[PDB]
């Protein structure tokens, strides 16, 4: 496919990993 | 590659984007 | 495309709904 495409995989993943953490962050504090 | 390809990565930029904005709505409520 | 393009697509759609899943939980416990 488009090395466009596997570019915007790239940013996808890395967006997901840094909103997993954030997650993580947030049960961390509250708990669950 | 697929126009249904990159009509997927469509909806998951829309889908993270949303996501986003909850994590801020929620980090905005505790604290961070 | 690539059949593995396809191949990372299907995880991240999965990620994402793992996410959507965890938001719920911490919008439950908190309240929104």
Request: proline share 0%; net charge negative.
């Amino acid at each position: 496919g488009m090395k466009q495409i596997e570019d915007k995989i790239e940013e996808i993943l890395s967006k997901i990993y840094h909103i997993e953490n954030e997650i993580a962050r947030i049960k961390k504090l509250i708990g669950e």
